[PDB]
Design a binder for this molecule. Sequence first.
Ligand code: NI
Ligand SMILES: [Zn+2]
Length: 347
Amino acid sequence: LNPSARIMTFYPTMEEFRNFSRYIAYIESQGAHRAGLAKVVPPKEWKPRASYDDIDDLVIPAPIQQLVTGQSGLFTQYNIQKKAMTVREFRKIANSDKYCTPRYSEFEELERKYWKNLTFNPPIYGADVNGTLYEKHVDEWNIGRLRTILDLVEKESGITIEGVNTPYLYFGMWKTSFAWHTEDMDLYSINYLHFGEPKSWYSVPPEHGKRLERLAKGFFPGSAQSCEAFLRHKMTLISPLMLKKYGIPFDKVTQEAGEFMITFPYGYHAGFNHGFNCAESTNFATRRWIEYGKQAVLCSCRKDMVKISMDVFVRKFQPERYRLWKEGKDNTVIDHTLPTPEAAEFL
Ligand code: NI
Ligand SMILES: [Zn+2]
């Protein structure tokens, strides 16, 4: 099943689209999780919002200017907090001559331009805006309420973690980047591209994630010494040519307006925006995640980074291991190829 761990694309019917959790289980039955990233194109008739012109009374509280330093396919991205702005201000900069999408023919050309120009003309990214663009009425794949076991954090312990159990909006322009990372606690993510230009993604299969970590640690021994999981800083950019040179297996895919991307536990990904767009994002879980959460290597160097108590998950969903786990004896080795238990119905 998917032996090259390539990114798969799915086209559910409206009937299939109703049960979020079941559909994640299904795409894992087909091997999607091996890639680390999958694309889901929703039914033609489904839309999460009637229109998107009413936008600008929405504030971007903390836009970030992305300064990139490096050379030879290896970069560090510094995020500089700017003053709050409207979508309107963002769009104007996005579409200005200095700071709009270059003319290009094929993706491959736009990609070359990205990697050639990523240290020049620092763009602004309207990242991490708390809020949703779904209407209250929309029940299918509603990023504001996906109803997975992740809900145990909010319902059992009361804690809300912005962008993790709540929706974030991202306003992109040309050449805004997301650095190589897995999700907080090695969770799943869902990303819906509401409108605008594409977002391009790179992915490294979870079964090869340790190999990328080794590579990263090799290139930045400074950061390795100061932090157990420096990639969680979301500052490290590494080009596909670099990955290819060091034999890291990876895939690429472009997400267009109206498509969902799913990332899987321990799926390293990175990418960039083609132009003005808006994405909405959140984290979520399945039972398979539990072991990943238990085994996640967290940032040890800056505090108020995202940590979830695994206790409630182990007790409830792995009752046979709860004791072994509490006394630190567990020792389960994760098999990255195994689909989530809920997929049994389809296997
Ligand atoms: Ni991510
Ligand atoms: Zn750290």
